[PDB]
Structures are given as structure tokens and as C-alpha cells.
Design a binder for this molecule. Structure first.
Ligand SMILES: Cc1cc2nc3c(=O)[nH]c(=O)nc-3n(C[C@H](O)[C@H](O)[C@H](O)COP(=O)(O)OP(=O)(O)OC[C@H]3O[C@@H](n4cnc5c(N)ncnc54)[C@H](O)[C@@H]3O)c2cc1C
Ligand SMILES: Cc1cc2nc3c(=O)[nH]c(=O)nc-3n(C[C@H](O)[C@H](O)[C@H](O)COP(=O)(O)OP(=O)(O)OC[C@H]3O[C@@H](n4cnc5c(N)ncnc54)[C@H](O)[C@@H]3O)c2cc1C
Ligand SMILES: Cc1cc2nc3c(=O)[nH]c(=O)nc-3n(C[C@H](O)[C@H](O)[C@H](O)COP(=O)(O)OP(=O)(O)OC[C@H]3O[C@@H](n4cnc5c(N)ncnc54)[C@H](O)[C@@H]3O)c2cc1C
Ligand SMILES: Cc1cc2nc3c(=O)[nH]c(=O)nc-3n(C[C@H](O)[C@H](O)[C@H](O)COP(=O)(O)OP(=O)(O)OC[C@H]3O[C@@H](n4cnc5c(N)ncnc54)[C@H](O)[C@@H]3O)c2cc1C
Lengths: 387, 387, 387, 387
């Protein structure tokens, strides 16, 4: 009962750890894993040791039991260091959410608990060749063959999909094309080692080069029936409800990117002399920095509201789509403006902002592109007006 | 103590009151008062009587002793009804602020007390014909003369002048030009009845026609020395302080208007059809709307954060300027979009959206133009990195 | 053969006549006409005298016989004075176009010829209270009844409506709803003094208040078939076809207003100072004028290009819509920035910039809303790639 | 004489030749060169062979004797393939520009003549690590010693730096700091293979990774008197001079990549369907294309105007500065939209769009940043309002 913008001693302690870790382990090696292309294996390890991975796993399963808000503050900090490794570890939680919300004790313990004992990854396999933003356009089919299920399809752009222990897998179990999404799709927690799982090579993408990404072909995969999340019929509802406590964490990573961009940009403008004065003394630049600051400022509050909304038992879907779009956009503007303020050196590879720009782009694409996000916001908006 | 984006019960009541009143009373007459431009007397009265006026006066002087956050919820609702009115009511709290923050109980009891017993209006006189934004250079003379001061200057655009019982005045004392703003001025209370004062005519502006914005000159106005606010010099430090508390409320004032524009566009979008499809069914109108809502939700948070910050004790200068600038910038955006949504009708006077566009402009102008706001934002921001 | 951004001596002098008139006779009275909302008859006939009216009438009907390029040119000048009066003039060319392109020697000499010898006004009746952007959705009836057509419907927002000698009118001639618009409507020439025509009440809008806009109720208005265009059914073609020769001049209208803004804004920037340095010295304001300058130079060429295109006998459509889309949008952006430059003053009625803010708006709404301008351009652009 | 947007049959040839080359030869090899970051030697000689490099060298030196308007013409088509390869080409015209406009006969035949018979390269040395935008701030010295000038200092970001056969070198001659720039710098023609020239490592930047941009240091580079452009003092003059011819050409570059990005995004929108329909059918995507199309056309008219002015014997600094300013900005908006329309695939290195977004940024940095472009435009525009 009363608005508050002050964290908790527990929450502050977190942001303190994450900060220290990012600024002191990730940043100093942020460039290498970007150049080299390789997976940030050890940093994944360190985060695990520092408890900054798999925050949401229910306490009973030994998981820390931290809410969406905590995930968002911790994530933003890591993102400040590198969105590559940040996204890498956020891959897990993304793929775990479906289980965490649709799982029964058995499913949850036998799968979450493993990550509890050892630093193992997991991926969210759903997006594929002709259906990305259009979730209900998946062709991967799941045919139940009595005892257990048979999977035959292909996925694409799966984060940490080549380093995952198990994958969340969506599929269509209703053959009739006109079979509605609420009853045509079915999900299956599916271990990796399952034969018939051929995984592609590391895709060369223009950013978040240390992040692991590739495709997967699931031809004649025998999925053990007990793994089917809620049961044949409810797959779509699961996946959709999962990221409601995910997108806010996504935005958190983007605003973390905006922040770094702003931090490197302001520092440079403070010492670069042009036309007898520090860049900051040039009103154009001053304005550039101010607006940049209010964008990062507004983006933080945009996710903090969505995290809190779900954390207080509500469907943050509306605000979730707000934070996601705003952060996703301003992330992109601040990066470029930062590269802009740095000048030639900004375009230079021996400088930070170069990477910051190429990375930010992805925030307007995965987990709801700018377009579809605005489609959801209006959907909810308009619905609060009709009868 | 953790974040909370949930009001306090008491607040919900005010909210409903400010609302009920605005939607059931201000609205039906907002256009008559726009057409005729006549001061909204019956409305302000009913506001004071309904208790949505002079909220910041402490319980001591027999006032509601309300904080800025509370004030903002109230103003943001009354604004949705008609900012022309909302401003007339606000000008009171704005002109009383300097006293409320820097006045001795003798002054407070006297001047703030009367405000409570009889519905009155006060004014904030600072801006002069050739001196606005640059407050540190308003040239109105105030000369020491025993137990009083003589004032010879000129103001322009006083909100509520011409209908004010008493004025808050910023005047230059130290005649020496090398005198830092700091000590250069001296602000005090001036009763309107004091001979020497000339009230100019109501300036006709584009929007917020019913507010009383007019000229005024002080031709050898005698202010008894007790009426001063702190001392010779303190002036610049007084009026300047009114902003920490007034600024957020102006943002709330913009947000209210934004909400009005939005509501109007959306209602129409759900009825008007073009090419066998409701306007809302066109992916372009839906996009416009998602961005309209995205703007307000964010803007709202921007001001609340500010109001809270100052109320929790810490300086909200950085946050206040963010809300003023942003809200002021989007309120105009939304306004023009609302007109566009209502097409031809939009440009017509027998529709709300058109009026909104005219009113909105002032939010990007008074209480520091958006340009100067960013000067502050960049100021507070860059200073952090230089500590 | 190659590119040339040079004018001809003839053009050069049209422009000069245009300017003198706009800057000497229109400009002074402009504001007075805006306040009253009165129809500017004096100027209308003065233009008619000076030949800055009805320049598309072929030299055989006693007209100037000028193309679209020379028209836009003249238009920008008048617009600069006031778009309210300019629209009142250009509105004639709109009602004339369908006759100029599709009329026949007998019709043209009768309905264009009377414009030559007298300062007569004429309108363009198409839009209906429930149809505007969706031309094909109009319901004004017109059915063969002997040797004349019987018209029964209502038109809305007709510029020059209550001041027109005759009107161009689009009516649904085929009762069968599945009648393809491309062969479903019929355009006629309807003398206003024809019984059954009830010219509606003068409407009141935000801007362009002196333009005599109002709806018409065609009550069993009987028009001879001799006034039909090239046939029953071809009316839609005439409507859509006239646009190609009218959109460029409407874009010039916007650019004219845009130049007035950049002038009042820049001129103030030179005599107004704040914080010691003139406004035009403050880097942000310099950047405002810079952005304002760019927006106009391009919009000018946009409409110029489009005019030339059609003048060279090509398909126009793709360039003209780009013009109207851009010119319409930037105009609003300049008129608004102009007000902001003059701060408190620019918002006041005693100032020229404020009026422009109201005017600018219709350049996004009327004669092809910005949204459909984009739709049109999208249709053309993509067609270059589809097979 | 009247306006014209028609090409001379001769220009239609240079275009068709350039389009043929750049699309059938640059485009394929392109991707590789960016990944490998290797100089496009093979492609360079090919252009030289087609006679569309050095277009500006006068006919008396065996050059083509082409104007700015014809260089841009060809340049865009060359850029459409790869601005990396094209920038490397423009490096020559740039190093050559100062000598084409300010070198005597013996100089023009000594240095231009060679580029005519052997496909050599040249470079432009002005920028210093401590100063680019602030040209008057370069610290390189020019000690007059007998029949030579001793160059001492460093240059940075020199395109063709290590591959160059000779460079144009601006430098400070008069040691007095209070020397007004316009008569304090001296431009030289320094032969690459001189004793005190030490190049340096190829700078790996985010974009245009096949054109070699390097730093370089001069340690007592005796330059003979014979190779000064106009004379001591006349360096700043001749330097500023060049920018007028070159500006439209760099704008041409940007506008080039813009259409590349616009074509790619459109070709994709016609093959990718989502939610039962190609992207071109969703208003959102379509609206992007329209606005993308508009900008490209206006940018085209941006540089074409700027090129025509200069070639007509007019001071194009005004239009040339809006051309580079605008074309640079929309090139960067397009590159990021193209990627967006191609979604996840757009972010994949295996697709062209991501490669455009990278090379695109440099257009808002080099040859004068968007900021100084606004300054010059604001500065060029204000002169028209004082006298
Ligand atoms: C590094 C990386 C990591 C990713 N990680 C994952 C992951 O871990 N798991 C996973 O399952 N997926 C992941 N993805 C995939 C990503 O989530 C999808 O590509 C995203 O959904 C966008 O869809 P698309 O490109 O297939 O959709 P497309 O529809 O092909 O999107 C392309 C464009 O079309 C527009 N568009 C489409 N439909 C509409 C419409 N109806 N209205 C308006 N505009 C429309 C889109 O907004 C976008 O601008 C990742 C991608 C990358 C590159
Ligand atoms: C209806 C209305 C009510 C008002 N009520 C009050 C009131 O109660 N009390 C009061 O004291 N005043 C009041 N004002 C005046 C208002 O406070 C001033 O309008 C505003 O603070 C500054 O405007 P000006 O006209 O003085 O602007 P100016 O002093 O002319 O300067 C503003 C213009 O220049 C720009 N600018 C100025 N300096 C800089 C700079 N250094 N850098 C960049 N840009 C700069 C601004 O962005 C804008 O373009 C009111 C105005 C209106 C229209
Ligand atoms: C002062 C004035 C004078 C006029 N004079 C004339 C005149 O002389 N003669 C005449 O015949 N008409 C005239 N008009 C009418 C004018 O052309 C219409 O106002 C215009 O066509 C659109 O307004 P509407 O109300 O019909 O738009 P609506 O049909 O109400 O459209 C409303 C909104 O929805 C958007 N929209 C519509 N369809 C789509 C879609 N498919 N996809 C996406 N967005 C869409 C529109 O862009 C607009 O924003 C005038 C209008 C005004 C304001
Ligand atoms: C790939 C590449 C190729 C190049 N090729 C060449 C070449 O062949 N030859 C050559 O001689 N140089 C070349 N350069 C250098 C390039 O022209 C400069 O880097 C560019 O002018 C920016 O100057 P800077 O990097 O020193 O910017 P800085 O001046 O260090 O700072 C620039 C930043 O601050 C802003 N800023 C600066 N002054 C002001 C002001 N007064 N008001 C407002 N904002 C301001 C700028 O707009 C930008 O945002 C090249 C650079 C690159 C990266």
C-alpha cells in the first residue's frame, strides 16, 4: 500500500554481486569471446558458482526460488558486461519456464534438480524455418505411438541448443491443419542424448558471437510419454504463458546494454576535446546524452513494472510487451548514438561501442519482434475498451 | 522495502473523487469554457469544495497536508477533463509552493490560512516580457526602504494574475550586475489589492483558453518587509525550490491529457469503419494505438517516480525534469495522433481531439521548455560521472 | 535533356507576382480573416485579377493553360501568405480538374469558360459523412430517369461548398452492390442553383477557418446527362485520375506553410536572446533551424519532381503521394517547431506561428490521408518487384 | 530554362555500365572480401578498366573529364554492390580533388597523368588522432627548410593509407597558434615512397572491412616546394574547396546502400509469409517499405541537387551539406529496417542485410559528421536572414 522504488537488502546484495562479477570477470574478456566466437564456458561456470543462474527454479527442487524481478536486476547487470554471455545464461531460464509452470513434481525434480547439482544448460526449441513470430505455424509433428511419442521435425536459431542437456520442445499433435492452436500443439521436455537428434554448426551471426546458436533436426525421436508437460493438447498455452515471466527479463538485458552504451558514451564525451571544449560543452551532445539517459531511465521502470506485475500474481502481458518493445528500441538507439559520439574510434574495433551496436539489434527480433509486440499491446489495450 | 506499484487505499478514494468530478462535471462544460474563454469559476469552486484544491497546505494551517504523489494522482485526473481548468486549479498550488517550502508560520498562517477559509487564487510571478527560461536575469526592481521594499518591474503570462488575491514575486534586489543570481534576487508575497499594481488584459492563447493568463506591472508597489520569504538574496533559492514539488504535477497534467487523447482515439477506432473494416482492424491504427498507450503508461511512471522521490526525502531534480520533458513531449504526440485517428472530424471543433492538440502545446513550453529540461537532465547525469 | 533545377523566365515572373501578392496583400489581412473566419472575397477576386487563379483552364476556354509545375509554384507563394485563403483558391482547380481531363469540348467551354470571365468558385463533391479515404464506399444515388439522372444523398466537408457556382460530383450509378468501383460510379457537373440542393451550414474547424467548408444534401437533384463526364460508370476513373494532377499542388501548399514557419521562427531566432547569446546562437536552436531547413528543401523537390513527372506526361502517382506524404508530415513538424522557438510568445494569438500549427494539420488529413498515401506508395513500390 | 529530371543518353550509359559491373561482379565477390577483410584489388583494376574510377581527372591529363553529377551517378551503382569496395574507389577522387581544383599544369600532369596509365591509388590525409571534425585543430607541422618543407606529425583513419601512391596532406605551417586557419595551413602532394613515411597496421573496423584505413606517421618527410598546391597559408582554402565537389559523391554512396537495403527487404517481403500471408500484405511491414522508398528517393534528389548546383558553377555547400546529412541518416535507418524485415535471418551473417547495417554507420562519421553537417546547414541558412 504505497508506491516504492527502493529494492530490498536481499535484492541489493544481488545487484552488488552481479555488478562485481560483470565489471570484474566478463567485461575484461568480453572482447575475446566476441572475436574468438567461442562459448564463454568458464563465465557460465562462475555465474553458477555465484548463483546468478537458474534463479527461478522452485526452492523445493533446491533452486534459489528468486522471482522475475530479481532475475531482471541481476540480468541487467550481466548485460552491462556482455549481452552474449548474458543471453547465454538467460537461455536456460527461458527454456525452463515451460517446465516450472506446467510441471508436476516428477518432471520438475528429475529435470530442474539436475541443473541444481551441476552447471548444465537447457534450450527452448520452438522457432523454426518458416514459423518464428508465428508460433502456431510450426510443422514439427508429434505422433503418439501408444507407450510414448514420436517426434519428426526441424528447429532453427536455438540458443544454447548445442550445449543444452535437455530441450523444451513444442510440436503439433493434431494432424488436421484447421485444428486450433489451443488443442493442436503439445510440448515435451526432451533430453538431448536421445538418438536421431542431429545438431547443426555454429551459425555466424553479426552479434552475440559467444552465445551458442544453431539448428536441430528431430527425425524419429522417441519421446518418453511421462515427459509431456501438461499432456497432449496443451502445448501452445504453456509456451505462451512461459515468457510472461521472461520478456521482462529480456528487456532487462536490453536496458543493461543501453546503460553500458550510455556509460562509455558519457565518459568519452567528458574528455574528448573538439573546437576548444569538452564534447559535453557542445549542446547537441549534451542533448544527446540527456535523451539517452531518460530512455535508459524509462526502460528500467518499464520492466520493473512488468516484473512486479507478475510477481504479485498478475498477467503482466500488457506491461511485459511495453517493457520489451521500449527497451528493445532504446537499446538500439543508445548503442548507435554511443558509436556516434565516440566518432571514428566508435567504428574502430578496439573500442566497446562497436560491439554494443551489433548486439543490441537482436532485441527487436527474438522473443517477440517490435511489430508483434505492438500487436499484443494493442490487442490488450483495445480489449480494455470493448464489451 | 521492495518495489510496489500499488497505490495506498486513501489514494484510491482521492482518485475516484478527482475522477468522478472531472468526468461528471468538468467535461460537459470544458468546451463552453473553451468557446467563450470565460474563467471556470463554478468548477474551481466545486473543486475546492470537493477538496481537490490547495492539497499542499499543511494540517497546521488547516490544510489536507497532502504530498506531491497524492497531488499528482489528483491533477492527472482533473487534466483528463480539461487542462485549461486543471491549470487554474494548479496555479494555486504552484504559487503557494514557495511559501509552503520557505515560509515562516506567520506568513504561512496568514496567507495559506485564508486560502482554506475562502476559495481564492494566488499567482507565481517570475517570467517577464523579455525574460522567461533565463530566470537568473528577470529585471524587476525591488529597493530597500525601511520596513518595506519598493517594486518597479514588469511580468507577463501570469497564470491566475488578474484573478489573484496575492502573488509570489521574484524581483532583483542587489542592483550590481556582478551579483550572482544566488544573492541577486529577493522573493516575497504581494497582495493584489496593493495600489501601484496594474493588471493587464487577458491574453488570448491557442489552448487553455479559460485559464487566466495576462500581463501585470508593479508601479511603486510597497511590500511590507515581513512579507519577504527568507531574506535579501534568498529569492533565487526560493522560487527555484518550488520546482522539485511542482514540476512532477505538470507531467501528471500532461499524462492526463495524453490519456484523454488516447481514450478518444480508441473509442472512435472501435466504431468508424473504412474499407469494410473497423479502424482498429487496420494494422496501422492498431500500431498507432499500441504506441499511444506505450507512451502514456511510461509517462505516468515517469512522474510518479519523481513525486515519490521528493516525498521519500531525496532530491528529485533529475527525475522531475525527465517526467516534465518526456510527458510534455508525448502529450503533444498523442494529441496530434488522436486528431488524425478521427480523420476529418478530428479537424472539426465539435470533437474533443482538436481541442486537445491546442492545449497540449503549453506542456512543452511553460515550467521550463523541453530544451531547458534536457539541459537539467544532462546536467544531473554528467555530474554523477564527474564525482 | 540532362537534369536542370533552373526555372524559365516566365515561371520566374509568375513566382514574383505570386510573392508580391502573398507578401503584400494576403499576409497583412490574413490574421484578421482567421479571427473572423470570414470568406476572403477581396483576395479571391484580386488573385482572379492577377491570374493566380484557374491556371489549368486550357487557352481555348480563355484560360492560362499552365501545367502542374507552374501551378505548384504559384501555390507555394499563396500558401505562404495563408493556406486558408490559398485552399479557397486551389479548391477551384480541384473541382475543375475532372472537367479538364475528362470533359468534352462542349462541357469544357461552358463550365470552364464562365470562370474565365467571372471570379466564380466551384467545388469537388465526393466525400460523404461516412466515406472519405474509402472513395468506393460512397452512397449518393444517381439513377437514369428519362434523359437526366436523379441524385439523392449527402456530401460532407466540401471546401467552397456554400460558395460554388457548380460542383463536380461522384455518385453510385450501379445499384448492384457487387459492381466493381472501376465501372460502378458516374461523375456529373451539377449547377448549384438546381432545385433540391440544400447547401449545409458553414462548418467550424481548427485551422483554415476562412475556407468555406460545409456539407450538401442532394435532394432528388436532377442533372442532365449532358453533364455526365465520359459515361455512366467512368466517374471513379476521373476522380482517381484528377488526383495525379492535384496532389502535387496540395503538397506545394504544405511546403508553403512550412516556409512561413521557418521564416517566422528563424527571424525571431535572430532578435531574441536568452543566457546572453541570441537564440540562434544556442546549438540546439541552430540544430532546430538546420533540421527545419532540410525538411523543406526536400519536400519542395518532392512536389516539384511529381509536378514535372505528370507535366512530362508520365505516371505521377508514386512520386506525388511521396510528396503529399512527406510535405504533409514535415509541414506539421515545422509549424510546431516554429511555435516552440518563440516560446510563450509563439503560443500566443498575437503571433503568426500559432495559426500555422492549426493550419498544418489538414495537410495530413484532407485529400489523401497520410496513412493511405503510404498505402498508395507501398502499392506502387512493391509492384516494381512482383511479376 | 525549365526543370528536368531526365538523363543525358551519355549518363544512361555510365549508369548501365556501372550497374552491370557492380551487380554482376561486385555483389558476388563482395561478401567474401568483407569476411576476409582483404583489399579488393581484383575489383579495383576492373573498375579502372571500365573507366569509372578517376572520372574527375581532366581530359588534358588523359582523364574522362566528368562532372560531380556524373561521378555520383556512377558512384551509387558502385555502392549498391559494396560501399567497402566503393569507398576504396572514392579514396582516389578525394586525394585527387584538391589537386584537380588547385594544382598547376605541371602538377596536374605529373600526378593525375599517372592514375591515367596505371591503376594506382591515392589518399586523403587530414584527420589526426586528436582532431577530425575540428580540421583547424591539426598539429602536423610544415617547417620551411630551403627548397623543401619538413612534415612532422600523424594522420589517422586514412582510406587507402598503405596502398596509396601519393597523398594529399594538409598541415600547419605558421607555428603561431593565433594564425587564422584560412592562411595558416599548407596542402602538399607527398609521394608515398618517401623515406620518413611510416604506415601502420590496418584498422579493423566494424564496417567496410575491405577498404584499408590506416594511421600513418611522417618523420622528417622532406617535401619539395614544387609540390605545394597554392602556397603557404592557402592549405585551408583548397581543403574546404574540395568538400564541395566530394560531398554529393559520399551522399551518393549512402543513397546507394540505401537502395541495396530497400531492394533486399522488398524481395524478401514477397517470399516470406506469416499468419497466412506474405509480409507485403501486413500493413506494418508495407508501411516500412513505403517510408523506406520515400527516403531513398528524397536522398537521391538530395545529392543530385547538390551535384547540379556545383556543376552549374554555384556554391553547393548548402545543398551538399543537407545531402550528406540526410542521405547519411536514412541510409542508417534503411540498413536497420532491412535487417528487421528479414528478422532472425536478417541477423544472420549468411544474409546481406546484416552486412549493410555495418558498413552503413561510417556515413554518419567520416567526411564530416551529421552534427557538423547540421552546423554548416544552420550556418548557411542563417546568412540568408541578416542584411
Ligand atoms: C541469436 C538468436 C537467438 C534466438 N534464440 C531463440 C531461442 O533460443 N529459441 C527460439 O525458439 N527462437 C530463438 N530465436 C528465433 C527468433 O525468436 C525468431 O526469428 C523471431 O521470432 C522472429 O521471427 P522470424 O524471423 O522467423 O519471423 P518472421 O516473421 O520471419 O519475421 C521477420 C519480420 O516480419 C515481421 N512480421 C511478421 N509477421 C508479422 C505480422 N503478422 N505483422 C507484422 N509484422 C510481421 C517481423 O516483425 C520481422 O520484422 C533466436 C534468434 C536469434 C538470431
Ligand atoms: C499560458 C502560459 C502560462 C504561463 N504561466 C506562467 C506563470 O505562471 N509564471 C511564469 O513565471 N511564467 C509563466 N509562463 C511563461 C513561461 O514560463 C515561459 O513561456 C517559459 O518558461 C520560457 O518561455 P519564454 O517565452 O520566456 O521563452 P524564451 O525566454 O523566449 O526562450 C525560450 C525559447 O528559446 C529556447 N531556449 C532558450 N534558451 C535556450 C538555451 N540556452 N538553449 C536552448 N534553447 C534555449 C526555448 O526552448 C524556446 O525555443 C506562461 C506561459 C504561457 C504561454
Ligand atoms: C477542411 C477539410 C476540407 C475537405 N474538403 C473536401 C472537399 O472539398 N471535397 C471532398 O470531397 N472531401 C473533402 N474533405 C474530406 C477529406 O478528404 C477526408 O477528410 C479524408 O479523405 C479522410 O477523412 P475521413 O474522415 O474520410 O477519414 P476516415 O475515413 O474517417 O479515416 C480515418 C483515419 O483512419 C485511417 N485509415 C483509413 N483507412 C485506413 C486503412 N485502410 N489503413 C490504415 N489506416 C486507415 C485514415 O488514414 C485516418 O487516419 C475535406 C476534409 C477537411 C478536413
Ligand atoms: C573508416 C573511416 C575512414 C576515414 N577516411 C578518412 C580519410 O580518407 N581521410 C581523412 O583525412 N580522414 C578520414 N577519416 C576520419 C573521419 O573523417 C573522422 O573520424 C570524422 O570526421 C570524425 O572526427 P573524429 O572521429 O575525430 O570525431 P570527434 O571530433 O573526435 O568527435 C566527434 C563526435 O562528436 C560530435 N561533435 C564534434 N564537434 C562537435 C560540435 N562542434 N558540435 C556538436 N557535436 C560535435 C561529432 O558529430 C561526433 O558525434 C575516416 C574515418 C573512418 C572511421
Amino acid at each position: 500500500l504505497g508506491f516504492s522504488f527502493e529494492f530490498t537488502e536481499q535484492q541489493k546484495e544481488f545487484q552488488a554481486t552481479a555488478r562485481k562479477f560483470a565489471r570484474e570477470e566478463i567485461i575484461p574478456v568480453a572482447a575475446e569471446y566476441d572475436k574468438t566466437g567461442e562459448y564463454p564456458v568458464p563465465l557460465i561456470r562462475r555465474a553458477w558458482e555465484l548463483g546468478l543462474m537458474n534463479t527461478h527454479i522452485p526452492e523445493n527442487c533446491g533452486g534459489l526460488g528468486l522471482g522475475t524481478f530479481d532475475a531482471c536486476l541481476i540480468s541487467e547487470e550481466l548485460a552491462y558486461g556482455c549481452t552474449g554471455v548474458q543471453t547465454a545464461i538467460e537461455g536456460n531460464s527461458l527454456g525452463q519456464m515451460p517446465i516450472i509452470i506446467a510441471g508436476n513434481d516428477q518432471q520438475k525434480k528429475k529435470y530442474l534438480g539436475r541443473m541444481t547439482e551441476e552447471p548444465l544448460m537447457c534450450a527452448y526449441c520452438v522457432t523454426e524455418p518458416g514459423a518464428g513470430s508465428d508460433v502456431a505455424g510450426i510443422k514439427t509433428k508429434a505422433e503418439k505411438k501408444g507407450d510414448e511419442y514420436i517426434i519428426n521435425g526441424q528447429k532453427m536459431w536455438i540458443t544454447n541448443g548445442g550445449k543444452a542437456n535437455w530441450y523444451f520442445l513444442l510440436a503439433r499433435s493434431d494432424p488436421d491443419p484447421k485444428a486450433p492452436a489451443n488443442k493442436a500443439f503439445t510440448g515435451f521436455i526432451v533430453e538431448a542424448d536421445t538418438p536421431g537428434i542431429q545438431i547443426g554448426r555454429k551459425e555466424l551471426n553479426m552479434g552475440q558471437r559467444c552465445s551458442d546458436t544453431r539448428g536441430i533436426v528431430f527425425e524419429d525421436v522417441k519421446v518418453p510419454k511421462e515427459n509431456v508437460l501438461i499432456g497432449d493438447g496443451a502445448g501452445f498455452k504453456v509456451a505462451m504463458g512461459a515468457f510472461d515471466k521472461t520478456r521482462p527479463v529480456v528487456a532487462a538485458g536490453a536496458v543493461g546494454l543501453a546503460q553500458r552504451a550510455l556509460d562509455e558514451a558519457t565518459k568519452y564525451a567528458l574528455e574528448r576535446k573538439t573546437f576548444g571544449k569538452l564534447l559535453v560543452e557542445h549542446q547537441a551532445i549534451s542533448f544527446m546524452l540527456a535523451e539517452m539517459a531518460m530512455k535508459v531511465e524509462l526502460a528500467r521502470m518499464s520492466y520493473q513494472r512488468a516484473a512486479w506485475e507478475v510477481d504479485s500474481g498478475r498477467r503482466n502481458t500488457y506491461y511485459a510487451s511495453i517493457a520489451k518493445a521500449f527497451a528493445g528500441d532504446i537499446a538500439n538507439q543508445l548503442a548507435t548514438d554511443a558509436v556516434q559520439i565516440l566518432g571514428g574510434n566508435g567504428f574502430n574495433t578496439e573500442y566497446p561501442v562497436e560491439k554494443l551496436m551489433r548486439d543490441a539489434k537482436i532485441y527487436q527480433i527474438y522473443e517477440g519482434t517490435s511489430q508483434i509486440q505492438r500487436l499484443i499491446v494493442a490487442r490488450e489495450h483495445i480489449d480494455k475498451y470493448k464489451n
